[PDB]
Ligand binder design. Sequence first.
Ligand SMILES: Cc1cc2nc3c(=O)[nH]c(=O)nc-3n(C[C@H](O)[C@H](O)[C@H](O)COP(=O)(O)O)c2cc1C
Ligand SMILES: Cc1cc2nc3c(=O)[nH]c(=O)nc-3n(C[C@H](O)[C@H](O)[C@H](O)COP(=O)(O)O)c2cc1C
Lengths: 399, 399
Amino acid sequence: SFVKDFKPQALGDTNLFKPIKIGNNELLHRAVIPPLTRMRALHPGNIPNRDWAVEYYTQRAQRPGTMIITEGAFISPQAGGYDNAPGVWSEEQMVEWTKIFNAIHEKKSFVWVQLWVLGWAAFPDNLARDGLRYDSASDNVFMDAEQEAKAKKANNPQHSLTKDEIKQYIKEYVQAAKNSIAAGADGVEIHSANGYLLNQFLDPHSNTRTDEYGGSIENRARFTLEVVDALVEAIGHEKVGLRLSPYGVFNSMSGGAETGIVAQYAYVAGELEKRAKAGKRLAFVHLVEPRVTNPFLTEGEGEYEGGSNDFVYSIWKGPVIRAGNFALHPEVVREEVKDKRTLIGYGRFFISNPDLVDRLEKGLPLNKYDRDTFYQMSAHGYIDYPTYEEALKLGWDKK
Amino acid sequence: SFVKDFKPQALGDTNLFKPIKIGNNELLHRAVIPPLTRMRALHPGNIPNRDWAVEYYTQRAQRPGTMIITEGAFISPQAGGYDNAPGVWSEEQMVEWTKIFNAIHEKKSFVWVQLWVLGWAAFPDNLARDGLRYDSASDNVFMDAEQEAKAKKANNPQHSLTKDEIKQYIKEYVQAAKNSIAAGADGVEIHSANGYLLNQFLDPHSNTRTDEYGGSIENRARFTLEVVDALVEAIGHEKVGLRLSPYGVFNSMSGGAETGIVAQYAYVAGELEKRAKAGKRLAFVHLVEPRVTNPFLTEGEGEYEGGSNDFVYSIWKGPVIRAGNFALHPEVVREEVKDKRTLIGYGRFFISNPDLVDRLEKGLPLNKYDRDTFYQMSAHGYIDYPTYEEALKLGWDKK
Ligand SMILES: Cc1cc2nc3c(=O)[nH]c(=O)nc-3n(C[C@H](O)[C@H](O)[C@H](O)COP(=O)(O)O)c2cc1C
Ligand SMILES: Cc1cc2nc3c(=O)[nH]c(=O)nc-3n(C[C@H](O)[C@H](O)[C@H](O)COP(=O)(O)O)c2cc1C
């Protein structure tokens, strides 16, 4: 059905439909598809789903000029740990990502691969099966009880990375960014949000290191800015973006309770503008809003309103994509895009509305999403959500 | 005359007239008199002006319940360097500050002494006369040409403080805070703004030290937070406040051009809320707005609007006094005091309008200020600006 009690509002008279250029791409509108894990990749191999992934992405690439950021893709085996999310390190994987990049491009939209490394959010048993370590910034703080039980049972203890092992993750990040560009992607987004490895080094609760990768604002951001610097040398700054969640608490990050958290992220945004001055301005900064602190909570659960992402605008002066509970609040978006360099990420509603960009333009109803197939190895709940027309021929009240 | 083309607006229906408690004081309204140097103290001795200072302060303390922050007062001889600003280290000085504190208190208003240390803004010749060093965070960066000529001619070179000399400034800060409280002040404001010593240690352009007082966000804030910590142990946190100017460029500070500047100040605001959690919440944070980047520029000159002070509210959760070009913009104040823990500092217009708080309440015209007696050793331009009544009996159009 459509979202029952929502009152749509057309947004076509707003800057959400003005073109803007991001990197080398000329978006026709500013609604972007933020990275969404769906768990349909194939085990063994972390292969993009050979039966349904081109159609899913082809479908969401339908309104021309859309920026699409893929699911997070693992840069290498040690970076992974979930059997059914895709990676971007092997030939077999790059043969199905090429097919996907081309079909999006057939539709004249654009595609940015999110590079993902799990840290302590990985399942330590999977990793153990495969001979891999269970990594994190430190080893005396664990994500949670379940993860702790899981590592003891796999007998795969959490491991504090050595400098030489951080350096190998910087080697795999560069390779995986060269492989995505070589296969046809328009750019890569570095995932340094949502409690995954890079964010475990940025946060004071998960990073209790004493070396130059922890213990100060400057040392906690170091691994994230080496990765930005190696990928801007490897493939160019117009092909790189950075996702950050300042106030997120998913996967045991501190959020707003750490009184130091605005300084930690202000510092990253400042270094990123330092580089802009020296010529190397990244394509965009992507921010998860505090209005969603964990994406597995229903819209309106875990709004963190003792803090705001607006500080970033004072420091970074380039395009900002913002994501988090914007589809059921077009009144909030209308205000937000009055800013001229703000793009809006719509995540749960791009799952359920393949044609979200026309619905937003025209003010049409929105298809409800089914939270039970967000992760399922099915086509159902993946490629079978209907466009408005189809939902009308289906008679989703209105027939 | 009155400010010719201004259109007053009564503000009595706003939160600028709701009581609020700051430290131990219960302000009857939220317009506060920010620290204003006027150069009427006596040489030798840096004595408060024995003929006109009680009347000036008595006059501005007229509407009951006003918070008054004094002129900056030098904590000790080495902290000074201007002959005619007052200090708070000797018995002769404390005998005239007592008289002043009592007359403000007679009027049932409150008085907070600003503790001041000059660093490189001092005149190096004066200091040389007296046997004093010309201090700063470092010695290979000088404030400007004039200051540089002045030090060479006095042959009083800029000196990088040793740790032991920072420690002696922390001893004099505590003493001068105990002397003001012992003489009757309601509290002290630490001046760590406007390019003076503590702000020379906070800023990356003036602080090129390699030790633990420079070279990182954490080390540049260290001298400012030891001073906060020594005064909260010496006289209690409800008696201490901190003034900061994030975007100021007066006295050669970086302002908005340093891409690191929001992180540097976010970090100070975070440590200040860390302490609040441990019980020791300071009385207030006082911020100079970017709408005035140097106070010797006319209203509307040097507005810095590529940055905002609103980040501080995300981090510090206690009272905030904001100051900077608010008297000719009551429409901006109306919006700003919708926040429930915001006080407004009015500086050039409290010079010229002894009764500013009633004029603001009632929407009356404003007396122009005379910028040539801001610093003069005269009563004229100090205690002879008229109240509205007197300006009407004088016939300042309307008679
Ligand atoms: C099912 C699902 C999977 C997600 N997986 C990822 C991911 O791969 N990488 C990422 O950065 N964010 C991930 N997110 C977060 C979304 O990108 C987005 O920040 C948030 O859901 C947007 O809020 P919204 O859905 O209210 O628009 C995921 C969200 C959903 C709903
Ligand atoms: C004549 C004069 C002297 C000043 N001296 C000081 C001082 O002693 N300490 C301080 O922190 N600010 C000083 N200031 C700055 C004001 O406190 C205030 O931040 C700024 O002038 C307020 O802006 P406004 O005058 O537009 O209200 C001075 C300002 C003036 C106009």
